[PDB]
C-alpha cells in the first residue's frame, strides 16, 4: 500500500494506490496520541472509479481538523487483515501574523549526566505558530525514528507563544550525530498572501545538537592552518628553481 503526499476554505486532493486488487478500501484519520477515526469506503465504480487509485479530496480546509491520515485496503472476509500504509498531517492557518516557518532549538546534556548515568539525553524544542498545528520528527542515520522518543501533541501555550519539546535518550562511538526536524504543511504556492512579512510555504526545518559546533569550529581551524603551512613549505621552491 502506497500513499502520497492551507488557507481556511482551501481544497486539496490526497492519493493512495495499491497493487493487491483489494476491493475493501477506505480512509483513516488519527487524532495524534489518543484516537483514530474512519472515512467511508467505495467498493467499485458507481458506488461509495478504479479499484487501484482511490483519491481523497477536501471540501473546505479548517483549522479544527488537526489529525494525520491513513488509507487502508483488504480483501473481504478471507482473512480479515486490514492492512495500513503511511500517513500525513494537515495544517490550516489563520495566516499572516500567526504562521511562521518553524524556529527549532536543540540542546546537549551536562558533563555530570554522562559521568554518572553513562547514557545521555538529547532534547529538541520548537516555538509554536498559531494555531496548534505542530509536528515533530527526529532524524538520525537517514530515517525518522520512533523508538525511544517522547511526543506531546499540544504545543504548550506560554502566555500567544508556544513551545513543544521531545526527548531522544542515548556513546562509545562518537560517530553518532543527531538532528531534529519538524514537517510543516504550510500554505500552498497557489493561495493569497501579502508579501510584507512574507509567506512560509510547506517546509521542513532542521536542528542539530550531538560538541554542537565545537567539531565544526575545530574543522575550520584546519583551513586556518593548512593553506599557510603549504605556503611556507612551498616558498622554498624558488631556491629549487
Amino acid at each position: 500500500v502506497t500513499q502520497t503526499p492551507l488557507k481556511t476554505g482551501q481544497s486539496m486532493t490526497l492519493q493512495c494506490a495499491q497493487d493487491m486488487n483489494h476491493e475493501y478500501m477506505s480512509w483513516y484519520r488519527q487524532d495524534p496520541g489518543m484516537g483514530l477515526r474512519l472515512i467511508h469506503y467505495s467498493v467499485g465504480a458507481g458506488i461509495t472509479s478504479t479499484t487501484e487509485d482511490f483519491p481523497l479530496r477536501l471540501l473546505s480546509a479548517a483549522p479544527s481538523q488537526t489529525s494525520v491520515y491513513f488509507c487502508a485496503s483488504s480483501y473481504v472476509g478471507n482473512t480479515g487483515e486490514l492492512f495500513f500504509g503511511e500517513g500525513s498531517r494537515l495544517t490550516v492557518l489563520e495566516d499572516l501574523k500567526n504562521v511562521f516557518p518553524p524556529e527549532v532549538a536543540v540542546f546537549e546534556p551536562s558533563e555530570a549526566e554522562i559521568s554518572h548515568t553513562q547514557k545521555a539525553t538529547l532534547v529538541c524544542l520548537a516555538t509554536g505558530f498559531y494555531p496548534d498545528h505542530v509536528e515533530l520528527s527526529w532524524w538520525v542515520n537517514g530515517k525518522e525514528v520512533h523508538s525511544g522518543v517522547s511526543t506531546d501533541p499540544q504545543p504548550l501555550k506560554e502566555q500567544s507563544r508556544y513551545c513543544l519539546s521531545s526527548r531522544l535518550r542515548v556513546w562509545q562511538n562518537p560517530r553518532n550525530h543527531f538532528r531534529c526536524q519538524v514537517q510543516f504543511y504550510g500554505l500552498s504556492e497557489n493561495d493569497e498572501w501579502t508579501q510584507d512579512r512574507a509567506k512560509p510555504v510547506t517546509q521542513i526545518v532542521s536542528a542539530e545538537a550531538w560538541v554542537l559546533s565545537a567539531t565544526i569550529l575545530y574543522e575550520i581551524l584546519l583551513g586556518k592552518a593548512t593553506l599557510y603551512a603549504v605556503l611556507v613549505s612551498a616558498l622554498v621552491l624558488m631556491a629549487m628553481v
Binding site: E111, I114, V211, A214, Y218
Partner: peptide
C-alpha cells in the same frame, strides 16, 4: 567533551 583534553594536550606540548 574532549576539547578540554585537547587543551591539556596543548599545554603539555608547550611545556614539553
Amino acid at each position: 567533551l574532549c576539547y578540554l583534553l585537547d587543551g591539556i594536550l596543548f599545554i603539555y606540548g608547550v611545556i614539553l
